[PDB]
């Protein structure tokens, strides 16, 4: 007589898996106990960050007239935003390349 | 077959379909997004663990997660992440 099984992601209105996040917190050796709201909060934060980066990368891809996001577009999105660049300052994106930037003294007169 | 290798790819793709319905993503970009999600998860969980240890608490709660988010994420990114987490937690609590 068990009720139809919902999911905690659906209860929280999230796309990221609350149950998987809770399992990873339990098995990650972070604490002896994990609160019920902790994986929900963490899944919401991860989803927000993913949505922000994917939004910026999709805008960059559209600007490049590409319909598919590529590591170059992820790199452009991350490096053109100061807060995301600060968050990922020490991170190397494979196949991301670099921002086009030439020092003004090097350009011809 | 082979042992199941769980990844965030399907959730990242759902988020992509929410934010930009008509665009797709390459496999390399999906791998980079998986690396990103894992790295941020590790950062937040480690900071929350440190906070709980400092406060002699055995339970990591949404308060620990919120404080970890404020410590790690900069400025407006942190503020919006806190708002998203709070909204999700309240919705979950209200079933």
């Amino acid at each position, epitope marked *: 007589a068990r009720a139809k099984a919902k999911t905690r992601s659906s209860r929280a209105g999230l796309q990221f898996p609350v149950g998987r996040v809770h399992r990873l917190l339990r098995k990650g050796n972070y604490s002896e106990r994990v609160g019920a709201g902790a994986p929900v909060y963490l899944a919401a934060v991860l989803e927000y960050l993913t949505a*922000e980066i994917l*939004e*910026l990368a999709g805008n960059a891809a559209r600007d490049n007239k590409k319909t598919r996001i590529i590591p170059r577009h992820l790199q452009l999105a991350i490096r*053109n*935003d*100061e*807060e995301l660049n600060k968050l990922l300052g020490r991170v190397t994106i494979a196949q991301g390349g670099v921002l086009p930037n030439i020092q003004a003294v090097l350009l011809p007169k | 077959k082979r042992s199941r290798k769980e990844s965030y790819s399907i959730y990242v793709y759902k988020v992509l379909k929410q934010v930009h319905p008509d665009t797709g993503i390459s496999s390399k970009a999906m791998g980079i997004m998986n690396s990103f999600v894992n790295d941020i998860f590790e950062r937040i969980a480690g900071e929350a663990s440190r906070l709980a240890h400092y406060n002699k608490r055995s339970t990591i709660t949404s308060r620990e997660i919120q404080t970890a988010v404020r410590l790690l994420l*900069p*400025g*407006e*990114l942190a503020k*919006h992440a806190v*708002s998203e987490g709070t909204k999700a937690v309240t919705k979950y609590t209200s079933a």
Partner: single-chain antibody, 227 residues
Framework: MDIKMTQSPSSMHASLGERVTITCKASQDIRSYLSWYQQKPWKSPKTLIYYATSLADGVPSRFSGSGSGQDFSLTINNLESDDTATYYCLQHGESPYTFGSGTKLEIKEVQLQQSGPELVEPGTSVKMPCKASGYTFTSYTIQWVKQTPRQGLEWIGYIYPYNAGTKYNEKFKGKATLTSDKSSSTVYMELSSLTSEDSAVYYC?????????????WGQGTSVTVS
């Protein structure tokens, strides 16, 4: 192809204490990137709601917003004396930002320093500064808005001091030019080929690079008048 924003009530008379709603219809899907602004006469607009549901910092819980996709609403519950003003919706889901016509309701620290009024003859050029203080200058874009009684508020363009990136409304390409000064934390707007049409109050506004972030703090406005 610009998203026109349609405010249904152009004016409203209401008594004290009673509830008031203001409806906004978007021409195209803006995907929940809508904000609401309150402007008392001869003063700069203050933000009320952002992301179509979220209260701005310091805004009382009396104000509330709802809606998504194309249709949005603003609500005020406990009407108080100060609530008499003009309310503008602003969408920023697409690159040319668009303001609403403005509902005139009548009832029974981050600092942006902006220059004073300017009197200029046609054809000459004017340069309005924007001294910003109270926050880390490079992290937030500076947005420029032109207000005319005949055409309302228009988004001109923005400067990102982090990388000097620019974007302009097509109506202001060439007419407007934006520059920044990291050393003095100042932004300058340049107008070329001045015309009587350019007689308007120009507001500098701060907006984070976050997409759901809206125009939060505004300068006092420079009243440029063309003879």
């Amino acid at each position: 192809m610009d998203i026109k924003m349609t405010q249904s009530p152009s004016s409203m008379h209401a008594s004290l204490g009673e509830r008031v709603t203001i409806t906004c219809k978007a021409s195209q899907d803006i995907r929940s990137y809508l904000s609401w602004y309150q402007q008392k006469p001869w003063k700069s607009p203050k933000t009320l709601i952002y992301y179509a549901t979220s209260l701005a910092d310091g805004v009382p819980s009396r104000f509330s917003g709802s809606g998504s996709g194309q249709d949005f609403s603003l609500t005020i519950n406990n009407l108080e004396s100060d609530d008499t003003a003009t309310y503008y919706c602003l969408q920023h889901g697409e690159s040319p930002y668009t303001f609403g016509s403005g509902t005139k309701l009548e009832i029974k620290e981050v600092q942006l320093q902006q220059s004073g009024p300017e009197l200029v003859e046609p054809g000459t050029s004017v340069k309005m500064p924007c001294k910003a203080s109270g926050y880390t200058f490079t992290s937030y874009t500076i947005q420029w808005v032109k207000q005319t009684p005949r055409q309302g508020l228009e988004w001109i363009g923005y400067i990102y001091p982090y990388n000097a990136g620019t974007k302009y409304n097509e109506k202001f390409k060439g007419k407007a030019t934006l520059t920044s000064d990291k050393s003095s934390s100042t932004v300058y707007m340049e107008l070329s080929s001045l015309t009587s049409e350019d007689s308007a109050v120009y507001y500098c506004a701060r907006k984070s690079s976050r997409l759901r972030s809206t125009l939060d703090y505004w300068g006092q406005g420079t009243s440029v008048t063309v003879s």
